[PDB]
């Protein structure tokens, strides 16, 4: 169909939770020139455990990435809308689930 | 629904609930947003600890909006993390 389109006018700089979290993370650039957007910043948990009250890595808990399913554009004149999974940040999980 | 793909929302020290943000004039119409259950984080004994805070991790995502359409950049909470005032 006639689309007749019109043209109109880094996570470290927007948020620092990556450094302040008990499950801290680093951000890595996933580059792809044949994909829109070309650069995607992915969160990678710094530690297996979480940072406890004394500042040590505690292995009674785990840093895990929170992954979000996002639609991305790819070249395949022709394009394809692909569903990709990206790590936005990390959270701390424990094996004991409490009620409160 | 994110509850069926992942259960970190219930196992995190900064747990969260998922709320449906409905909009028929936006594509997609339904967006599941994470809302932290507590202000504090769940400590080693199972209590809400206020020496730390549950905070949402927000992601900037492109969404479609209303023959004519516009591509808008929106911010969504994917989940929660636990932050402390002491950085080690």
């Amino acid at each position: 169909v006639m689309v007749n389109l019109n043209i109109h006018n880094n996570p470290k700089r927007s948020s620092d939770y990556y450094n302040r979290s008990t499950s801290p993370w680093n951000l890595h650039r996933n580059e792809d020139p044949e994909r829109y957007p070309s650069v995607i910043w992915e969160a990678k948990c710094r530690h297996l455990g979480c940072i406890n009250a004394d500042g040590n890595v505690d292995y009674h808990m785990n840093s895990v990435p929170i992954q979000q399913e996002i639609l991305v554009l790819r070249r395949e004149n022709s394009f394809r809308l692909e569903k990709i999974l990206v790590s936005v940040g990390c959270t701390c999980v424990t094996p004991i689930v409490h009620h409160v | 629904n994110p509850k069926r793909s992942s259960d970190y929302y219930n196992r995190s020290t900064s747990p969260w609930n998922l709320h449906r943000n409905e909009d028929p004039e936006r594509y997609p119409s339904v967006i599941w947003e994470a809302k932290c259950r507590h202000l504090g984080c769940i400590n080693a004994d199972g209590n809400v600890d206020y020496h730390m805070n549950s905070v949402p991790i927000q992601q900037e995502i492109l969404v479609l909006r209303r023959n004519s359409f516009r591509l808008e950049k929106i911010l969504v909470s994917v989940g929660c993390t636990c932050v402390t005032p002491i950085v080690h």
């Epitope: 292995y59 009674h60 895990v64 992954q67 999980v93 094996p95 004991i96 | 992942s6 259960d7």
Partner: antibody
Framework: EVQLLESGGGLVQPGGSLRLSCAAS????????MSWVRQAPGKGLEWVSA????????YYADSVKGRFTISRDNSKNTLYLQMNSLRAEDTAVYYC???????????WGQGTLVTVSS | NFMLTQPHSVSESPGKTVTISCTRS????????VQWYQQRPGSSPTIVIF?????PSGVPDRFSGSIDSSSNSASLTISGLKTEDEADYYC?????????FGGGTKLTVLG
């Protein structure tokens, strides 16, 4: 209800290869670290390998390093264990296990028998 | 790496309290969660205790877990011992890389 169903076991010649599968259901598979544990007949439980929920981190017992590969398909809810260069000492019932965190196993599968014999 | 030492067997009478110990060779035991599994003949292991002292539903109140920092050992306690408690018991723990099981303990209910 948590279900872990192992497949792929059987007879393998020494120096041979075999791939085990574990089909999981009753839980959100991608948010759980998974493990392989083996038991030779009339002997104790021996940890083999572990993999994080995302598949980004893998761990191996010294006795299987280089020869085995743990992997997972989160869209298929399947855990795999690729075994290369098999030896008689690898003969065991192989169990698939669900972990709440790394090293905390909460559920076990029924096992699949692997026999390494000429 | 590290090892976990368990007694090869333990024998007690019905209604008595039995303790199975698990001693860690290296690394602080209190830094990593201890699990305990029961294995009946020709069966898959089942969890009795996870995360040092957590008892899943279906596991009788008679089973309890504890840890001792000074002795670097974990214990599985069974109070009000029953004939149905005969089985093999394995302790298990980990470090940032490895996962280790103890050698196992054959529990014999006497008389």
């Amino acid at each position: 209800e948590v279900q872990l169903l192992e497949s792929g076991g059987g007879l393998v010649q020494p120096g041979g290869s075999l791939r085990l599968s574990c089909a999981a259901s009753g839980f959100t598979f991608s948010s759980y670290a998974m493990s392989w544990v083996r038991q030779a007949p009339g002997k104790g439980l021996e940890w083999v390998s572990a993999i994080s929920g995302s598949g980004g981190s893998t761990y191996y017992a010294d006795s299987v390093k280089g020869r085995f590969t743990i992997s997972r398909d989160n869209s298929k809810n399947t855990l795999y264990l690729q075994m290369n260069s098999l030896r008689a000492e690898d003969t065991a019932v192989y169990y698939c296990a669900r972990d709440l965190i790394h090293g905390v196993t909460r559920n076990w599968g029924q096992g699949t028998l692997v026999t390494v014999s000429s | 790496n590290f090892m976990l030492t368990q007694p090869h067997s333990v024998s007690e009478s019905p209604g008595k309290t039995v303790t199975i110990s698990c001693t860690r060779s290296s690394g602080s035991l209190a830094n990593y969660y201890v699990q305990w599994y029961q294995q009946r003949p020709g069966s898959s292991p089942t969890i009795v205790i996870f995360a040092n002292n957590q008892r899943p539903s279906g596991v009788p109140d008679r089973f309890s877990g504890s840890i001792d920092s000074s002795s670097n050992s974990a214990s599985l306690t069974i109070s009000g011992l029953k004939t149905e408690d005969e089985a093999d018991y394995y302790c298990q723990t980990y470090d940032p890389y490895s996962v280790v099981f103890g050698g196992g303990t054959k529990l014999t209910v006497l008389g």
